[PDB]
Tab-separated table of C-alpha atoms in Angstrom:
chain	number	residue	atom	x	y	z
A	1	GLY	CA	-0.017	-0.049	-0.364
A	2	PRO	CA	1.386	4.019	0.084
A	3	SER	CA	1.504	3.998	4.059
A	4	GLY	CA	0.246	5.884	6.427
A	5	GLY	CA	2.931	8.195	6.332
A	6	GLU	CA	3.055	9.190	2.120
A	7	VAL	CA	-0.496	9.703	2.214
A	8	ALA	CA	-0.533	12.370	5.382
A	9	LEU	CA	2.248	13.476	3.040
A	10	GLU	CA	0.585	14.710	0.098
A	11	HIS	CA	-2.992	15.131	1.311
A	12	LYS	CA	-0.590	18.017	3.304
A	13	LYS	CA	0.895	19.257	-0.075
A	14	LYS	CA	-2.273	18.904	-1.583
A	15	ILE	CA	-4.170	21.044	0.673
A	16	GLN	CA	-1.457	23.315	0.227
A	17	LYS	CA	-1.978	24.029	-3.315
A	18	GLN	CA	-4.796	24.703	-3.091
A	19	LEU	CA	-4.772	26.946	-0.579
A	20	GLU	CA	-2.225	29.127	-2.044
A	21	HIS	CA	-4.283	29.159	-5.820
A	22	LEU	CA	-7.097	30.343	-3.341
A	23	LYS	CA	-5.070	33.352	-1.729
A	24	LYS	CA	-3.163	34.699	-5.277
A	25	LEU	CA	-7.060	34.147	-6.469
A	26	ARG	CA	-7.848	36.839	-3.512
A	27	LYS	CA	-4.865	38.813	-3.928
A	28	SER	CA	-5.637	39.575	-7.770
A	29	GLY	CA	-9.190	40.390	-6.603
A	30	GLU	CA	-7.720	43.269	-4.665
A	31	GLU	CA	-5.184	44.445	-6.963
A	32	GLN	CA	-8.260	44.215	-9.889
A	33	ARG	CA	-10.238	46.564	-7.689
A	34	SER	CA	-7.169	48.681	-6.875
A	35	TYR	CA	-6.651	49.031	-10.733
A	36	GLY	CA	-10.173	49.624	-11.776
A	37	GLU	CA	-9.812	52.768	-8.696
A	38	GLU	CA	-6.970	54.309	-9.682
A	39	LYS	CA	-7.569	53.694	-13.443
A	40	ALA	CA	-11.297	55.711	-12.836
A	41	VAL	CA	-9.452	58.282	-10.887
A	42	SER	CA	-7.066	59.148	-13.684
A	43	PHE	CA	-10.321	58.774	-16.456
A	44	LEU	CA	-11.838	61.171	-14.348
A	45	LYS	CA	-8.963	63.343	-13.614
A	46	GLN	CA	-8.043	63.404	-17.749
A	47	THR	CA	-11.651	64.398	-18.998
A	48	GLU	CA	-11.901	67.171	-16.496
A	49	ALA	CA	-8.717	68.509	-18.000
A	50	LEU	CA	-10.001	68.525	-20.931
A	51	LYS	CA	-13.236	70.256	-20.425
A	52	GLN	CA	-11.474	73.030	-19.030
A	53	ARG	CA	-9.295	72.900	-22.002
A	54	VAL	CA	-12.184	73.100	-24.378
A	55	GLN	CA	-13.764	75.984	-21.928
A	56	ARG	CA	-10.400	78.027	-21.839
A	57	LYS	CA	-10.408	77.776	-25.488
A	58	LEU	CA	-13.981	79.168	-25.995
A	59	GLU	CA	-13.055	81.879	-23.619
A	60	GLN	CA	-10.908	83.030	-25.977
A	61	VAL	CA	-12.974	82.410	-28.530
A	62	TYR	CA	-15.675	84.792	-27.008
A	63	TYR	CA	-13.472	87.603	-26.033
A	64	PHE	CA	-11.930	87.793	-29.723
A	65	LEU	CA	-15.241	87.911	-31.176
A	66	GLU	CA	-16.012	90.695	-29.039
A	67	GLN	CA	-12.680	93.030	-29.777
A	68	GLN	CA	-13.367	91.859	-33.388
A	69	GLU	CA	-17.368	93.171	-32.721
A	70	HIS	CA	-15.929	96.049	-31.484
A	71	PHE	CA	-13.045	96.941	-34.063
A	72	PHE	CA	-15.946	96.705	-36.811
A	73	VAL	CA	-18.525	99.364	-35.175
A	74	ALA	CA	-15.665	101.639	-35.137
A	75	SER	CA	-14.518	101.481	-38.907
A	76	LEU	CA	-17.873	101.918	-39.862
A	77	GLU	CA	-18.314	104.723	-37.493
A	78	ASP	CA	-14.796	106.526	-38.757
A	79	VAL	CA	-16.720	105.869	-41.852
A	80	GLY	CA	-19.456	107.769	-40.764
A	81	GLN	CA	-17.977	110.545	-39.801
A	82	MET	CA	-15.793	111.072	-43.137
A	83	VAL	CA	-18.717	110.773	-44.999
A	84	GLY	CA	-20.177	113.609	-42.931
A	85	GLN	CA	-17.023	115.748	-43.327
A	86	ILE	CA	-16.909	115.392	-46.863
A	87	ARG	CA	-20.346	115.914	-47.617
A	88	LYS	CA	-19.991	119.243	-45.214
A	89	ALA	CA	-16.742	120.623	-47.004
A	90	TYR	CA	-18.334	120.202	-50.654
A	91	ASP	CA	-21.884	122.022	-49.230
A	92	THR	CA	-19.709	124.916	-48.006
A	93	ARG	CA	-18.040	125.398	-51.072
A	94	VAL	CA	-21.018	124.840	-53.168
A	95	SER	CA	-22.996	127.314	-51.642
A	96	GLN	CA	-20.033	129.650	-52.129
A	97	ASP	CA	-20.140	129.259	-55.496
A	98	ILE	CA	-23.717	129.927	-55.542
A	99	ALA	CA	-23.566	132.982	-53.381
A	100	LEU	CA	-21.343	134.209	-55.970
A	101	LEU	CA	-23.988	133.894	-58.437
A	102	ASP	CA	-26.637	135.480	-56.727
A	103	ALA	CA	-24.030	138.440	-56.595
A	104	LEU	CA	-23.927	138.415	-60.385
A	105	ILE	CA	-27.365	137.616	-60.974
A	106	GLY	CA	-29.276	140.284	-58.715
A	107	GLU	CA	-27.073	143.152	-60.340
A	108	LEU	CA	-27.850	142.511	-63.990
A	109	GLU	CA	-31.561	142.009	-63.071
A	110	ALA	CA	-31.790	145.197	-60.228
A	111	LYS	CA	-30.016	147.283	-63.252
A	112	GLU	CA	-31.942	145.779	-66.237
B	1	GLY	CA	-23.147	151.972	-88.895
B	2	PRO	CA	-24.395	149.002	-87.650
B	3	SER	CA	-27.976	151.329	-86.178
B	4	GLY	CA	-29.002	152.097	-82.783
B	5	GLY	CA	-32.059	149.619	-83.267
B	6	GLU	CA	-29.250	146.473	-84.021
B	7	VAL	CA	-26.640	147.480	-81.176
B	8	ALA	CA	-29.582	147.773	-78.985
B	9	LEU	CA	-30.911	144.002	-79.869
B	10	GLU	CA	-27.311	142.182	-79.720
B	11	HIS	CA	-26.894	144.040	-76.223
B	12	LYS	CA	-30.199	142.864	-75.250
B	13	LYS	CA	-29.522	139.333	-76.304
B	14	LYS	CA	-26.135	138.801	-75.039
B	15	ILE	CA	-26.931	140.040	-71.769
B	16	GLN	CA	-29.780	137.624	-71.976
B	17	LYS	CA	-27.371	134.785	-72.712
B	18	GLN	CA	-25.438	135.846	-69.676
B	19	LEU	CA	-27.916	135.573	-67.253
B	20	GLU	CA	-29.025	132.093	-68.497
B	21	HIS	CA	-25.760	130.966	-68.760
B	22	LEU	CA	-25.427	132.152	-64.443
B	23	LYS	CA	-29.161	131.038	-63.464
B	24	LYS	CA	-27.954	127.207	-64.814
B	25	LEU	CA	-24.699	127.799	-62.825
B	26	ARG	CA	-26.856	128.822	-59.488
B	27	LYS	CA	-29.784	125.332	-60.354
B	28	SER	CA	-26.556	123.333	-61.075
B	29	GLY	CA	-25.181	124.468	-57.636
B	30	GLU	CA	-28.710	123.694	-55.790
B	31	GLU	CA	-28.749	119.907	-57.112
B	32	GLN	CA	-24.647	119.664	-56.285
B	33	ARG	CA	-26.026	120.422	-52.752
B	34	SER	CA	-29.138	118.415	-53.197
B	35	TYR	CA	-27.482	115.230	-55.019
B	36	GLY	CA	-24.340	114.972	-52.400
B	37	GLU	CA	-27.012	115.330	-49.185
B	38	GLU	CA	-29.394	112.449	-50.623
B	39	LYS	CA	-26.213	110.286	-51.292
B	40	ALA	CA	-24.800	111.243	-47.699
B	41	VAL	CA	-27.846	109.962	-46.175
B	42	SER	CA	-28.243	107.036	-48.169
B	43	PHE	CA	-24.313	105.963	-47.569
B	44	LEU	CA	-25.003	106.602	-43.699
B	45	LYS	CA	-28.178	104.363	-43.556
B	46	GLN	CA	-26.381	101.119	-46.398
B	47	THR	CA	-23.809	101.571	-43.601
B	48	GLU	CA	-26.188	101.470	-40.384
B	49	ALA	CA	-27.881	98.516	-42.286
B	50	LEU	CA	-24.622	96.532	-42.522
B	51	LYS	CA	-23.278	97.495	-39.218
B	52	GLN	CA	-26.611	95.581	-37.555
B	53	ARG	CA	-26.266	92.760	-40.323
B	54	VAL	CA	-23.072	91.716	-38.764
B	55	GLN	CA	-24.054	92.293	-35.027
B	56	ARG	CA	-27.344	89.945	-34.996
B	57	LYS	CA	-24.957	87.516	-36.946
B	58	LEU	CA	-22.209	87.452	-33.920
B	59	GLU	CA	-24.880	87.422	-31.505
B	60	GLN	CA	-25.927	84.446	-33.606
B	61	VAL	CA	-22.222	83.032	-33.304
B	62	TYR	CA	-22.060	83.890	-29.667
B	63	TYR	CA	-25.256	81.955	-28.559
B	64	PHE	CA	-24.008	78.688	-30.883
B	65	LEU	CA	-21.044	78.739	-28.794
B	66	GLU	CA	-23.351	78.613	-25.675
B	67	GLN	CA	-25.268	76.076	-26.877
B	68	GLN	CA	-22.447	74.200	-27.924
B	69	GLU	CA	-20.113	74.897	-25.219
B	70	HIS	CA	-23.334	73.489	-23.018
B	71	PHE	CA	-23.860	70.556	-25.038
B	72	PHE	CA	-20.045	69.925	-24.584
B	73	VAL	CA	-19.619	69.959	-20.628
B	74	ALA	CA	-22.863	67.626	-20.613
B	75	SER	CA	-21.296	65.259	-23.188
B	76	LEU	CA	-18.096	64.742	-20.640
B	77	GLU	CA	-20.336	64.853	-17.459
B	78	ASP	CA	-22.076	61.816	-18.847
B	79	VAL	CA	-18.802	60.266	-19.540
B	80	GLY	CA	-18.249	61.014	-15.885
B	81	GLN	CA	-21.382	59.045	-14.723
B	82	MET	CA	-20.378	56.089	-16.785
B	83	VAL	CA	-17.167	55.419	-15.961
B	84	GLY	CA	-18.264	55.886	-11.979
B	85	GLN	CA	-21.268	53.093	-12.490
B	86	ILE	CA	-18.663	50.774	-14.357
B	87	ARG	CA	-16.731	51.637	-11.412
B	88	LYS	CA	-18.607	50.430	-9.006
B	89	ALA	CA	-20.745	47.477	-11.016
B	90	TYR	CA	-16.666	45.895	-10.940
B	91	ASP	CA	-16.086	47.230	-7.664
B	92	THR	CA	-19.328	45.544	-6.464
B	93	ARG	CA	-18.770	42.043	-8.335
B	94	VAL	CA	-15.219	41.826	-7.568
B	95	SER	CA	-15.432	42.089	-4.063
B	96	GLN	CA	-18.632	39.264	-4.049
B	97	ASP	CA	-15.909	37.376	-4.909
B	98	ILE	CA	-13.356	38.220	-2.869
B	99	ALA	CA	-15.408	37.848	0.320
B	100	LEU	CA	-16.340	34.167	-1.319
B	101	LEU	CA	-12.731	33.095	-1.617
B	102	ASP	CA	-12.168	34.719	2.278
B	103	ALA	CA	-14.959	32.346	3.022
B	104	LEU	CA	-12.980	29.422	1.515
B	105	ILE	CA	-9.677	30.796	3.393
B	106	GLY	CA	-10.697	30.684	7.056
B	107	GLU	CA	-12.151	27.242	6.445
B	108	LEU	CA	-9.366	25.638	4.986
B	109	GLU	CA	-7.092	27.962	7.541
B	110	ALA	CA	-9.132	27.126	11.113
B	111	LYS	CA	-9.345	23.242	10.460
B	112	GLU	CA	-6.015	23.437	9.457
C	1	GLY	CA	-17.743	8.700	17.050
C	2	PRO	CA	-19.487	10.012	13.711
C	3	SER	CA	-19.817	6.175	12.085
C	4	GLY	CA	-18.593	5.656	8.654
C	5	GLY	CA	-21.476	7.021	7.097
C	6	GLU	CA	-21.706	10.169	8.395
C	7	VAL	CA	-18.002	11.095	7.655
C	8	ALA	CA	-18.265	9.777	4.028
C	9	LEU	CA	-21.899	12.351	4.408
C	10	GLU	CA	-20.029	15.296	5.465
C	11	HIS	CA	-17.019	14.937	3.278
C	12	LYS	CA	-19.316	14.967	0.445
C	13	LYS	CA	-21.362	17.470	1.177
C	14	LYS	CA	-17.824	19.319	2.269
C	15	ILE	CA	-16.392	19.463	-1.495
C	16	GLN	CA	-19.595	19.648	-2.969
C	17	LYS	CA	-20.331	23.196	-1.822
C	18	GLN	CA	-16.283	23.775	-2.566
C	19	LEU	CA	-17.052	23.113	-6.274
C	20	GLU	CA	-20.550	25.087	-6.168
C	21	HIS	CA	-17.663	28.267	-4.971
C	22	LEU	CA	-15.034	27.919	-6.755
C	23	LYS	CA	-17.567	27.268	-10.322
C	24	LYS	CA	-19.561	30.434	-9.071
C	25	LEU	CA	-16.032	32.248	-9.176
C	26	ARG	CA	-15.455	31.045	-12.743
C	27	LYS	CA	-18.912	32.006	-13.452
C	28	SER	CA	-18.291	35.752	-12.614
C	29	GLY	CA	-15.057	35.347	-14.099
C	30	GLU	CA	-16.395	34.867	-17.738
C	31	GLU	CA	-19.129	37.501	-16.809
C	32	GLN	CA	-16.397	40.394	-15.991
C	33	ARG	CA	-14.781	39.328	-18.968
C	34	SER	CA	-17.835	39.605	-21.274
C	35	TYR	CA	-19.032	42.791	-19.515
C	36	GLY	CA	-15.841	44.535	-19.873
C	37	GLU	CA	-15.480	43.768	-23.336
C	38	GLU	CA	-19.384	45.195	-24.243
C	39	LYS	CA	-18.598	47.874	-22.167
C	40	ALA	CA	-15.425	48.627	-24.054
C	41	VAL	CA	-17.272	48.561	-27.131
C	42	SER	CA	-19.829	51.014	-26.588
C	43	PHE	CA	-17.687	53.357	-24.805
C	44	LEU	CA	-15.422	53.458	-27.717
C	45	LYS	CA	-19.083	53.979	-30.498
C	46	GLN	CA	-19.929	57.096	-28.379
C	47	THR	CA	-17.193	58.288	-28.434
C	48	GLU	CA	-16.679	58.088	-32.234
C	49	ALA	CA	-20.217	59.191	-32.360
C	50	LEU	CA	-19.321	62.253	-30.459
C	51	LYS	CA	-15.904	62.759	-32.616
C	52	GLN	CA	-18.158	63.041	-35.776
C	53	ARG	CA	-20.602	65.059	-33.716
C	54	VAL	CA	-17.852	67.611	-33.275
C	55	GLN	CA	-16.807	67.310	-37.181
C	56	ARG	CA	-19.752	67.767	-38.245
C	57	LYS	CA	-20.286	70.870	-36.568
C	58	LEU	CA	-16.825	72.031	-36.877
C	59	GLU	CA	-17.952	71.432	-40.727
C	60	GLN	CA	-20.901	74.024	-40.530
C	61	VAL	CA	-18.527	76.783	-38.739
C	62	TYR	CA	-15.976	76.631	-41.625
C	63	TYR	CA	-18.748	76.821	-44.296
C	64	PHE	CA	-20.702	79.603	-42.410
C	65	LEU	CA	-17.461	81.900	-42.223
C	66	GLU	CA	-17.130	80.957	-46.281
C	67	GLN	CA	-20.669	82.446	-46.934
C	68	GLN	CA	-20.068	85.576	-44.938
C	69	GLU	CA	-16.603	86.283	-46.173
C	70	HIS	CA	-18.606	86.102	-49.490
C	71	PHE	CA	-20.835	88.171	-48.367
C	72	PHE	CA	-18.505	91.119	-47.113
C	73	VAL	CA	-16.420	91.178	-49.574
C	74	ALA	CA	-19.237	91.709	-52.273
C	75	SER	CA	-20.596	94.055	-49.695
C	76	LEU	CA	-17.806	96.232	-49.915
C	77	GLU	CA	-17.348	95.908	-53.802
C	78	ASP	CA	-20.647	97.367	-54.125
C	79	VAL	CA	-19.754	100.238	-51.363
C	80	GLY	CA	-16.314	100.458	-54.045
C	81	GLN	CA	-19.094	100.486	-56.933
C	82	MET	CA	-21.103	103.284	-55.152
C	83	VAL	CA	-18.016	105.790	-54.475
C	84	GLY	CA	-16.803	105.485	-57.923
C	85	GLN	CA	-20.444	106.636	-59.722
C	86	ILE	CA	-20.969	109.396	-57.433
C	87	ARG	CA	-17.529	110.410	-58.500
C	88	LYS	CA	-18.449	110.031	-61.861
C	89	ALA	CA	-21.336	111.772	-61.629
C	90	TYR	CA	-20.547	115.174	-59.820
C	91	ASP	CA	-16.995	115.209	-62.062
C	92	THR	CA	-19.347	114.870	-65.486
C	93	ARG	CA	-21.349	117.981	-63.629
C	94	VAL	CA	-18.797	119.780	-62.812
C	95	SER	CA	-16.626	120.014	-65.614
C	96	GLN	CA	-19.525	121.097	-67.180
C	97	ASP	CA	-20.208	123.764	-64.782
C	98	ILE	CA	-16.625	124.409	-65.666
C	99	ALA	CA	-16.806	124.034	-69.296
C	100	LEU	CA	-19.943	126.420	-69.714
C	101	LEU	CA	-17.497	129.267	-67.030
C	102	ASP	CA	-14.952	128.992	-70.181
C	103	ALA	CA	-17.906	130.040	-72.533
C	104	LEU	CA	-18.194	132.900	-70.703
C	105	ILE	CA	-14.821	133.343	-69.975
C	106	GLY	CA	-13.147	133.278	-73.397
C	107	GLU	CA	-16.562	135.982	-74.034
C	108	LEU	CA	-15.456	138.764	-72.026
C	109	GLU	CA	-11.141	138.141	-72.652
C	110	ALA	CA	-11.786	138.026	-76.414
C	111	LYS	CA	-13.852	141.648	-76.580
C	112	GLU	CA	-11.469	143.002	-74.210
D	1	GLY	CA	-23.570	164.340	-67.056
D	2	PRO	CA	-20.557	162.255	-65.503
D	3	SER	CA	-18.340	162.606	-68.269
D	4	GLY	CA	-16.908	160.483	-70.824
D	5	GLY	CA	-14.086	159.328	-68.689
D	6	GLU	CA	-15.743	158.360	-65.656
D	7	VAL	CA	-17.958	156.385	-67.900
D	8	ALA	CA	-15.104	154.287	-69.309
D	9	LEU	CA	-14.380	153.908	-65.735
D	10	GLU	CA	-17.140	152.502	-64.174
D	11	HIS	CA	-17.442	150.233	-67.217
D	12	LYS	CA	-13.870	148.761	-66.969
D	13	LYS	CA	-14.270	148.215	-62.980
D	14	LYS	CA	-17.486	146.617	-63.513
D	15	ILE	CA	-16.488	143.939	-66.629
D	16	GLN	CA	-13.468	143.233	-64.358
D	17	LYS	CA	-15.492	142.572	-61.201
D	18	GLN	CA	-16.906	140.007	-63.317
D	19	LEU	CA	-14.316	138.124	-64.811
D	20	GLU	CA	-13.001	137.661	-61.493
D	21	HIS	CA	-15.509	136.174	-59.956
D	22	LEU	CA	-16.214	134.084	-63.237
D	23	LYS	CA	-12.687	132.997	-63.091
D	24	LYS	CA	-12.907	132.156	-59.068
D	25	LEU	CA	-16.310	130.220	-59.891
D	26	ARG	CA	-13.858	128.020	-62.202
D	27	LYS	CA	-10.825	127.468	-59.968
D	28	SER	CA	-13.824	126.576	-57.661
D	29	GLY	CA	-15.232	123.992	-60.229
D	30	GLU	CA	-11.355	122.219	-60.734
D	31	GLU	CA	-10.946	122.096	-56.888
D	32	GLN	CA	-14.240	120.555	-56.950
D	33	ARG	CA	-13.172	118.262	-59.164
D	34	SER	CA	-9.772	117.123	-57.575
D	35	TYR	CA	-11.309	116.788	-53.888
D	36	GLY	CA	-13.823	114.435	-54.869
D	37	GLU	CA	-10.744	112.961	-56.707
D	38	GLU	CA	-8.633	112.145	-54.048
D	39	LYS	CA	-11.702	111.565	-51.495
D	40	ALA	CA	-12.717	108.819	-53.994
D	41	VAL	CA	-9.049	107.663	-54.049
D	42	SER	CA	-8.552	107.598	-50.518
D	43	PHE	CA	-12.297	106.265	-49.670
D	44	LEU	CA	-11.533	103.103	-52.074
D	45	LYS	CA	-7.973	102.605	-50.485
D	46	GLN	CA	-9.490	102.620	-46.489
D	47	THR	CA	-11.735	99.907	-47.807
D	48	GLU	CA	-9.649	97.771	-49.887
D	49	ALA	CA	-7.795	98.073	-46.105
D	50	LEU	CA	-10.455	96.600	-44.412
D	51	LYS	CA	-11.306	93.974	-47.027
D	52	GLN	CA	-7.597	92.549	-46.319
D	53	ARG	CA	-7.877	93.186	-42.531
D	54	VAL	CA	-11.170	91.010	-42.252
D	55	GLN	CA	-9.552	88.150	-44.849
D	56	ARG	CA	-6.256	87.918	-42.780
D	57	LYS	CA	-8.701	88.002	-39.198
D	58	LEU	CA	-10.784	85.044	-41.486
D	59	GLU	CA	-7.773	83.095	-42.404
D	60	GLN	CA	-6.386	83.504	-38.331
D	61	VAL	CA	-9.541	81.977	-37.568
D	62	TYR	CA	-9.871	79.158	-39.807
D	63	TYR	CA	-6.166	78.216	-39.202
D	64	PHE	CA	-7.708	78.247	-35.571
D	65	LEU	CA	-9.966	75.761	-35.840
D	66	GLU	CA	-8.149	73.220	-37.693
D	67	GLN	CA	-5.951	72.711	-34.878
D	68	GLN	CA	-8.412	72.752	-32.666
D	69	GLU	CA	-10.508	70.192	-34.778
D	70	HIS	CA	-6.756	68.469	-34.930
D	71	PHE	CA	-6.260	68.754	-31.305
D	72	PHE	CA	-10.027	67.122	-30.803
D	73	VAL	CA	-9.528	64.146	-32.378
D	74	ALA	CA	-6.247	63.361	-31.322
D	75	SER	CA	-7.259	63.604	-27.773
D	76	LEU	CA	-10.505	61.136	-28.258
D	77	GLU	CA	-8.022	58.979	-30.162
D	78	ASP	CA	-5.827	59.127	-26.938
D	79	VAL	CA	-8.714	58.175	-24.992
D	80	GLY	CA	-9.453	55.085	-27.655
D	81	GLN	CA	-6.156	53.566	-27.012
D	82	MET	CA	-6.619	54.162	-22.722
D	83	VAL	CA	-9.971	52.190	-23.122
D	84	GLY	CA	-8.382	49.415	-25.520
D	85	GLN	CA	-5.465	49.004	-22.848
D	86	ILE	CA	-7.497	49.101	-20.253
D	87	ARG	CA	-9.682	46.352	-21.688
D	88	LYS	CA	-6.600	44.685	-22.472
D	89	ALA	CA	-4.996	44.317	-18.974
D	90	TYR	CA	-8.561	43.199	-17.085
D	91	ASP	CA	-8.973	40.742	-19.749
D	92	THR	CA	-5.381	38.880	-19.614
D	93	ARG	CA	-5.636	39.452	-15.542
D	94	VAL	CA	-9.370	37.773	-15.478
D	95	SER	CA	-8.910	34.658	-17.953
D	96	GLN	CA	-6.074	34.427	-15.805
D	97	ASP	CA	-7.883	33.883	-12.777
D	98	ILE	CA	-10.414	31.878	-14.466
D	99	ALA	CA	-7.446	29.251	-15.871
D	100	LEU	CA	-6.360	29.092	-11.829
D	101	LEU	CA	-10.097	28.208	-11.204
D	102	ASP	CA	-10.392	25.398	-14.415
D	103	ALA	CA	-6.948	23.988	-12.295
D	104	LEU	CA	-9.262	24.203	-8.964
D	105	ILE	CA	-12.033	22.660	-11.023
D	106	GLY	CA	-11.016	19.676	-13.157
D	107	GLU	CA	-8.809	18.394	-9.998
D	108	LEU	CA	-12.232	17.367	-7.751
D	109	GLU	CA	-14.132	16.898	-11.121
D	110	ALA	CA	-11.945	13.790	-11.823
D	111	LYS	CA	-10.737	12.811	-8.867
D	112	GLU	CA	-14.766	12.868	-7.607
């Protein structure tokens, strides 16, 4: 037969190997739950950063449109003022032509 | 000699043409002043139109960036929730395995 | 003590519960692997959808900037052609006025 | 009577004062044509400048979108490659745990 000695032996080893596999499995559990955690934390963290990058960009754009809106209205205001001064200057001039034609008019008319 | 009659005639005509060429010039002055004004009025007007068009536009761009900013933060919030629920559901599950491995461990390791 | 029948019994029950726990653990493994796959799949999918949505958007912005740039150059082209017509219409008119003043100039200048 | 002398005198002055007003008016004419020209030239020129400023802007904006589109698709590719690697690493680790239960399974299921 096998003998009481060598039966006890193998069973001891046998239960040893078992309890070894199990405790790994349980280690692997804890690492798995750990990797999951740190990875979820990392994910959320980066994502946050994406959310802020994209925001800070949109701010930069917002303000850029405002400055451009501003510059644009000011250009056209400026145009406004120019058309105004070219009008005025011509008018002053043409009416001085006209006042001087009236001079020439009334005099021929009033003697005649 | 050219006669007193034909002298008087030529002068009369000669002085009429002059008063004619003058009163045109004066008419022509009033028209230039009038055209100048109308056309400054118009120019300003269209310019104003251009001004508002661009604003009302930039307004459309502004609100469009808001909508998209909203949709973007909200997408990423969603991702947030998902990652989270995927961390919880794995955790629960793995921790179940673990406590069930512990059940197996104590047992071997207390008859041992 | 227990008798042959009650040890054989307990051991049978004992090895059964064990195999019952192991095999759940093995089922729970397969579920875990399956869930992690289906969930990587859907996450990638949604991501993709995010990718194309943002793209489809930027496309819409690109072409909007093009149509507006277009309208703007054409607007200013218009301004150009208007300034040019008001310049021409005034020139024609003044040079008439002028050519007629010359009519009157040479007249006196030539008799005197 | 006023004497042939002081009649010749008045007429001389009278005609002088006329050819004087009529030559100013004619100068005033060509100055009007000159002023309107250089001011058409100036107006067109600034306008041209406005035209090109708006373009070089819209050109800066366009390239800015391209770069953001680029950064965005790369971020998400990145996310892609991450999800994949986390999927991979769990998978290895779980099917490993599995095979280990399969070692434990067949053992009982062949001695039994």
